[PDB]
Amino acid sequence: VSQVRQNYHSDCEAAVNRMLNLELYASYTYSSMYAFFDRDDVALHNVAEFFKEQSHEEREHAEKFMKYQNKRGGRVVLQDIKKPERDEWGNTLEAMQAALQLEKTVNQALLDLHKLATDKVDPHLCDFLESEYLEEQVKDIKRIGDFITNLKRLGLPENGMGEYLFDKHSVKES
Amino acid sequence: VSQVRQNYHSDCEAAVNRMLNLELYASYTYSSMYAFFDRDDVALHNVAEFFKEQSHEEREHAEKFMKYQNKRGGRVVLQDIKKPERDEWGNTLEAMQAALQLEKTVNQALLDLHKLATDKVDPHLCDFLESEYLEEQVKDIKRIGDFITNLKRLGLPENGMGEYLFDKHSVKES
Amino acid sequence: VSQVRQNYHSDCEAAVNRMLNLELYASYTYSSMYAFFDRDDVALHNVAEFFKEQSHEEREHAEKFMKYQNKRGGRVVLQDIKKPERDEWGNTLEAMQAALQLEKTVNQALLDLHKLATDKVDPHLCDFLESEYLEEQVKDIKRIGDFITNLKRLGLPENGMGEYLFDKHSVKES
Amino acid sequence: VSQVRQNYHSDCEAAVNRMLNLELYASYTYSSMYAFFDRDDVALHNVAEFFKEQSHEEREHAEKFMKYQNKRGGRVVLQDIKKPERDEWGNTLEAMQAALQLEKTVNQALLDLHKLATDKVDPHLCDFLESEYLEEQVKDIKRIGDFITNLKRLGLPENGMGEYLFDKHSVKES
Ligand SMILES: [Cl-]
Ligand SMILES: [Cl-]
Ligand SMILES: [Cl-]
Ligand SMILES: [Cl-]
Ligand SMILES: [Cl-]
Ligand SMILES: [Cl-]
Ligand SMILES: [Cl-]
Ligand SMILES: [Cl-]
Ligand SMILES: [Cl-]
Ligand SMILES: [Cl-]
Ligand SMILES: [Cl-]
Ligand SMILES: [Cl-]
Ligand SMILES: [Cl-]
Ligand SMILES: [Cl-]
Ligand SMILES: [Cl-]
Ligand SMILES: [Cl-]
Ligand SMILES: [Cl-]
Ligand SMILES: [Cl-]
Ligand SMILES: [Cl-]
Ligand SMILES: [Cl-]
Ligand SMILES: [Cl-]
Ligand SMILES: [Cl-]
Ligand SMILES: [Cl-]
Ligand SMILES: [Cl-]
Ligand SMILES: [Cl-]
Ligand SMILES: [Cl-]
Ligand SMILES: [Cl-]
Ligand SMILES: [Cl-]
Ligand SMILES: [Cl-]
Ligand SMILES: [Cl-]
Ligand SMILES: [Cl-]
Ligand SMILES: [Cl-]
Ligand SMILES: [Cl-]
Ligand SMILES: [Cl-]
Ligand SMILES: [Cl-]
Ligand SMILES: [Cl-]
Ligand SMILES: [Cl-]
Ligand SMILES: [Cl-]
Ligand SMILES: [Cl-]
Ligand SMILES: [Cl-]
Ligand SMILES: [Cl-]
Ligand SMILES: [Cl-]
Ligand SMILES: [Cl-]
Ligand SMILES: [Cl-]
Ligand SMILES: [Cl-]
Ligand SMILES: [Cl-]
Ligand SMILES: [Cl-]
Ligand SMILES: [Cl-]
Ligand SMILES: [Cl-]
Ligand SMILES: [Cl-]
Ligand SMILES: [Cl-]
Ligand SMILES: [Cl-]
Ligand SMILES: [Cl-]
Ligand SMILES: [Cl-]
Ligand SMILES: [Cl-]
Ligand SMILES: [Cl-]
Ligand SMILES: [Cl-]
Ligand SMILES: [Cl-]
Ligand SMILES: [Cl-]
Ligand SMILES: [Fe+2]
Ligand SMILES: [Fe+2]
Ligand SMILES: [Fe+2]
Ligand SMILES: [Fe+2]
Ligand SMILES: [Fe+2]
Ligand SMILES: [Fe+2]
Ligand SMILES: [Fe+2]
Ligand SMILES: [Fe+2]
Ligand SMILES: [Fe+2]
Ligand SMILES: [Fe+2]
Ligand SMILES: [Fe+2]
Ligand SMILES: [Fe+2]
Ligand SMILES: [Fe+2]
Ligand SMILES: [Fe+2]
Ligand SMILES: [Fe+2]
Ligand SMILES: [Fe+2]
Ligand SMILES: [Mg+2]
Ligand SMILES: [Mg+2]
Ligand SMILES: [Mg+2]
Ligand SMILES: [Mg+2]
Ligand SMILES: [Mg+2]
Ligand SMILES: [Mg+2]
Ligand SMILES: [Mg+2]
Ligand SMILES: [Mg+2]
Ligand SMILES: [Mg+2]
Ligand SMILES: [Mg+2]
Ligand SMILES: [Mg+2]
Ligand SMILES: [Mg+2]
Ligand SMILES: [Mg+2]
Ligand SMILES: [Mg+2]
Ligand SMILES: [Mg+2]
Ligand SMILES: [Mg+2]
Ligand SMILES: [Mg+2]
Ligand SMILES: [Mg+2]
Ligand SMILES: [Mg+2]
Ligand SMILES: [Mg+2]
Ligand SMILES: [Mg+2]
Ligand SMILES: [Mg+2]
Ligand SMILES: [Mg+2]
Ligand SMILES: [Mg+2]
Ligand SMILES: [Mg+2]
Ligand SMILES: [Mg+2]
Ligand SMILES: [Mg+2]
Ligand SMILES: [Mg+2]
Ligand SMILES: [Mg+2]
Ligand SMILES: [Mg+2]
């Protein structure tokens, strides 16, 4: 009943709201990782800044869904942002493994939303996901996988020198 | 079993490897056309350079598939690059006609890969083909068709002055 | 019977075509190494880019032989480009050892071509090889040998930290 | 008996003087072609300027041999510069065919001088010919052959429009 609404199924509107929540959840998990690596007894600053930036990017993903919802005439409905699964993240390897799984969880939700949009014959929503979300996921999943391979090569979790070197050379100097 | 792999069917992985080979094959055919037009008894330099650039572009298409394969967690598998169908290319008209058919053959393979990706519900691969390959083919097919029309207008194959003028005015001065 | 042909033996013409094929073969082998180091379970980006550049350089070597053939009035004859000997390259040390042997194989073929050119009293072809090919081989063979020495010093194949450091410090940052 | 002379055979000294004369002869022939195409009843200005530049380049080739002779401690001995074989050059095709044969005659003399230098074990003279003369000949022979192919394609000698177009598009605008 929005004056702009056209070819936008209620199911897709609802699924966009759920996806928005998941983006915010992902942002919050990354924020927790930032704070962990900033601890004085962890002290891997470039890794911390990597996760801070990851958090900001997820927040941007969320805001883009809010804007999308309104563009199509749907209505943003917010729910609680659940706290992350862990309060402490072990080390760079454990955190990167959790990040990989988080990005794959987000990717699966996006793929599921694409299936729904396809089922409801919504090519605009399909294009939006393909053009703004799906390649970002593939690229970041590859980046994080590459990191994990290098962390293993560097002898994580046991090799502290390896972990130190990863922070200096693999992630952006901040 | 790659840690990055998600929603990537074995059939699509294999078809990407076959497509990679076809891009390399197309590159090699264009390289042969370059060398032919550079012969002292052919001596159409702008036409030669046109095909040299076509060859480099196909090589870039191939490299982009290699990168894609790895991004999705598939594994690049290479096969022999078959030599071109001809050792000599007749004249500018015959070569352009062969180029048109080559670009249409490549296009059909890309369309077939899109059908497979659609069947396997792989929207990332669909988007990749649509965003990076399919429009390039339509544009180049149109360009080459336009050239063939002009070569016929110029009296090819019999009209040597027509062929000379095409090289001076239709293809980029190199 | 080309109008430009002068002092160019049929044997040399044929050997130039065979050398052209070998340059293309070398290019393809280096392309395979690039793709291997770009895998998410290998993930040595600077090493990957090193081999990508090696591949492009071999392609340039091939194109220079095509141009040479035509300049002398010979005729380019292409054959299949055989796929590389391996589908996977083990690690940076194994790949560099294979690269060393590849560059020495190419060098031996160039030296053999120089012997033929000398036998047929073709000083232009001798000069072409000496001025455009032979020093490139000596320089690259030295570079790759130096790399292998450093990879051994760094404890390859067992020392993953050593391999990580080589990628950061020995090859160009890409 | 020159104080600088070392490893310079009398035969090579004499052959350098004969080569010098041939370069001057080639210059003079090209000058005649320039004057012919500048005639009001020929009037192909870009072709005329092409041959004028060819003439100046041969003069530079001659001067470089004079300098070489003195560098090695030989003595420049000059002979008459014979007038060209023709007083009129027919048309662009006939002139280009004569230019091709002239450049091949010069090339054969250079190759013969290289054989002599090789026989007398004079690597400096071999290098001088290879580095300063032999590639220039191959390149110019290819250029002129390419021109002849295009003149034939353009319908020379009968097709006056073809000849006009060659002057506008194949040779440098002067
Ligand atoms: Cl609606
Ligand atoms: Cl509709
Ligand atoms: Cl609805
Ligand atoms: Cl909702
Ligand atoms: Cl709950
Ligand atoms: Cl977790
Ligand atoms: Cl915890
Ligand atoms: Cl997760
Ligand atoms: Cl957007
Ligand atoms: Cl995207
Ligand atoms: Cl990327
Ligand atoms: Cl990495
Ligand atoms: Cl370790
Ligand atoms: Cl890294
Ligand atoms: Cl999968
Ligand atoms: Cl899925
Ligand atoms: Cl599968
Ligand atoms: Cl395969
Ligand atoms: Cl086969
Ligand atoms: Cl064909
Ligand atoms: Cl053929
Ligand atoms: Cl085809
Ligand atoms: Cl891309
Ligand atoms: Cl495209
Ligand atoms: Cl267009
Ligand atoms: Cl056109
Ligand atoms: Cl016609
Ligand atoms: Cl015109
Ligand atoms: Cl056109
Ligand atoms: Cl010959
Ligand atoms: Cl000879
Ligand atoms: Cl022969
Ligand atoms: Cl051959
Ligand atoms: Cl075979
Ligand atoms: Cl091997
Ligand atoms: Cl293998
Ligand atoms: Cl080898
Ligand atoms: Cl060169
Ligand atoms: Cl070199
Ligand atoms: Cl050096
Ligand atoms: Cl080194
Ligand atoms: Cl070690
Ligand atoms: Cl450093
Ligand atoms: Cl080093
Ligand atoms: Cl002496
Ligand atoms: Cl001596
Ligand atoms: Cl003597
Ligand atoms: Cl003398
Ligand atoms: Cl006389
Ligand atoms: Cl004559
Ligand atoms: Cl005469
Ligand atoms: Cl002559
Ligand atoms: Cl000099
Ligand atoms: Cl030279
Ligand atoms: Cl050249
Ligand atoms: Cl030309
Ligand atoms: Cl005609
Ligand atoms: Cl024009
Ligand atoms: Cl031309
Ligand atoms: Fe970022
Ligand atoms: Fe991310
Ligand atoms: Fe996200
Ligand atoms: Fe990212
Ligand atoms: Fe292009
Ligand atoms: Fe193309
Ligand atoms: Fe292509
Ligand atoms: Fe194109
Ligand atoms: Fe390089
Ligand atoms: Fe190399
Ligand atoms: Fe090479
Ligand atoms: Fe090199
Ligand atoms: Fe010139
Ligand atoms: Fe010349
Ligand atoms: Fe000369
Ligand atoms: Fe020249
Ligand atoms: Mg209203
Ligand atoms: Mg609703
Ligand atoms: Mg949820
Ligand atoms: Mg709770
Ligand atoms: Mg995109
Ligand atoms: Mg983005
Ligand atoms: Mg990367
Ligand atoms: Mg694994
Ligand atoms: Mg499979
Ligand atoms: Mg195939
Ligand atoms: Mg075959
Ligand atoms: Mg597009
Ligand atoms: Mg493109
Ligand atoms: Mg157009
Ligand atoms: Mg002929
Ligand atoms: Mg032969
Ligand atoms: Mg071979
Ligand atoms: Mg085989
Ligand atoms: Mg020598
Ligand atoms: Mg030399
Ligand atoms: Mg050199
Ligand atoms: Mg070089
Ligand atoms: Mg060095
Ligand atoms: Mg004295
Ligand atoms: Mg004497
Ligand atoms: Mg003489
Ligand atoms: Mg006389
Ligand atoms: Mg040179
Ligand atoms: Mg020069
Ligand atoms: Mg040219």
Side-chain angles (χ1 to χ4, degrees), chain C residues 89-137:
Chain C
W89 296 98
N91 56 60
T92 307
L93 177 57
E94 291 192 20
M96 285 294 179
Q97 285 167 152
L100 180 64
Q101 292 315 305
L102 179 64
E103 297 275 356
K104 292 188 95 175
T105 294
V106 168
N107 199 33
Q108 190 60 61
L110 293 161
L111 291 169
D112 291 350
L113 184 50
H114 195 283
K115 278 198 213 153
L116 176 63
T118 296
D119 280 341
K120 299 306 192 183
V121 199
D122 190 334
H124 187 268
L125 178 50
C126 287
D127 168 81
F128 178 64
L129 297 170
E130 289 166 55
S131 302
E132 300 298 323
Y133 290 86
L134 296 184
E135 162 61 13
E136 166 60 20
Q137 287 318 101

Side-chain angles (χ1 to χ4, degrees), chain A residues 1-171 173-174:
Chain A
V1 84
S2 161
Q3 73 193 319
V4 306
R5 200 194 188 103
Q6 186 168 30
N7 195 39
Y8 195 49
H9 201 280
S10 176
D11 293 2
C12 295
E13 176 179 357
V16 164
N17 283 329
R18 293 193 295 275
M19 192 68 225
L20 166 56
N21 187 265
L22 182 57
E23 301 286 5
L24 293 167
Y25 175 83
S27 181
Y28 202 24
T29 285
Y30 276 130
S31 196
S32 178
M33 294 183 184
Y34 153 69
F36 177 76
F37 288 97
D38 183 64
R39 287 166 55 155
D40 78 89
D41 57 5
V42 182
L44 294 162
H45 180 71
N46 294 332
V47 173
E49 292 292 325
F50 172 85
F51 291 126
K52 189 175 191 187
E53 181 174 313
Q54 288 275 353
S55 177
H56 292 176
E57 289 158 348
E58 295 295 346
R59 243 258 143 203
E60 291 175 324
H61 301 165
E63 292 181 321
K64 187 178 286 176
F65 274 121
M66 293 190 279
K67 189 177 170 210
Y68 187 86
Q69 188 73 285
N70 281 333
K71 282 168 71 167
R72 294 299 301 277
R75 296 286 165 255
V76 171
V77 178
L78 301 176
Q79 302 298 340
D80 293 350
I81 307 166
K82 297 294 202 182
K83 71 185 189 176
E85 277 293 288
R86 294 175 59 173
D87 295 320
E88 68 81 32
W89 296 98
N91 56 60
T92 307
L93 177 57
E94 291 192 20
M96 285 294 179
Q97 285 167 152
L100 180 64
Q101 292 315 305
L102 179 64
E103 297 275 356
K104 292 188 95 175
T105 294
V106 168
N107 199 33
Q108 190 60 61
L110 293 161
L111 291 169
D112 291 350
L113 184 50
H114 195 283
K115 278 198 213 153
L116 176 63
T118 296
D119 280 341
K120 299 306 192 183
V121 199
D122 190 334
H124 187 268
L125 178 50
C126 287
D127 168 81
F128 178 64
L129 297 170
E130 289 166 55
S131 302
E132 300 298 323
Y133 290 86
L134 296 184
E135 162 61 13
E136 166 60 20
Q137 287 318 101
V138 163
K139 197 178 161 59
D140 215 27
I141 288 164
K142 179 61 163 68
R143 176 166 63 164
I144 295 163
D146 287 359
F147 283 157
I148 291 163
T149 296
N150 279 286
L151 289 157
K152 288 179 177 184
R153 162 180 294 125
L154 285 163
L156 275 286
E158 298 91 349
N159 198 322
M161 180 183 293
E163 193 166 9
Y164 178 89
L165 288 168
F166 179 91
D167 170 276
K168 297 310 188 183
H169 295 297
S170 289
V171 282
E173 176 58 38
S174 296

Side-chain angles (χ1 to χ4, degrees), chain C residues 30 54 57-58 103 136 140:
Chain C
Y30 276 130
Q54 288 275 353
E57 289 158 348
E58 295 295 346
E103 297 275 356
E136 166 60 20
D140 215 27

Side-chain angles (χ1 to χ4, degrees), chain D residues 114-126:
Chain D
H114 195 283
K115 278 198 213 153
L116 176 63
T118 296
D119 280 341
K120 299 306 192 183
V121 199
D122 190 334
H124 187 268
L125 178 50
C126 287

Side-chain angles (χ1 to χ4, degrees), chain D residues 21-81:
Chain D
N21 187 265
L22 182 57
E23 301 286 5
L24 293 167
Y25 175 83
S27 181
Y28 202 24
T29 285
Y30 276 130
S31 196
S32 178
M33 294 183 184
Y34 153 69
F36 177 76
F37 288 97
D38 183 64
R39 287 166 55 155
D40 78 89
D41 57 5
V42 182
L44 294 162
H45 180 71
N46 294 332
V47 173
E49 292 292 325
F50 172 85
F51 291 126
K52 189 175 191 187
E53 181 174 313
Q54 288 275 353
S55 177
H56 292 176
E57 289 158 348
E58 295 295 346
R59 243 258 143 203
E60 291 175 324
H61 301 165
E63 292 181 321
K64 187 178 286 176
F65 274 121
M66 293 190 279
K67 189 177 170 210
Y68 187 86
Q69 188 73 285
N70 281 333
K71 282 168 71 167
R72 294 299 301 277
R75 296 286 165 255
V76 171
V77 178
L78 301 176
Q79 302 298 340
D80 293 350
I81 307 166

Side-chain angles (χ1 to χ4, degrees), chain C residues 143 146-148 150 166 170:
Chain C
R143 176 166 63 164
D146 287 359
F147 283 157
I148 291 163
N150 279 286
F166 179 91
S170 289

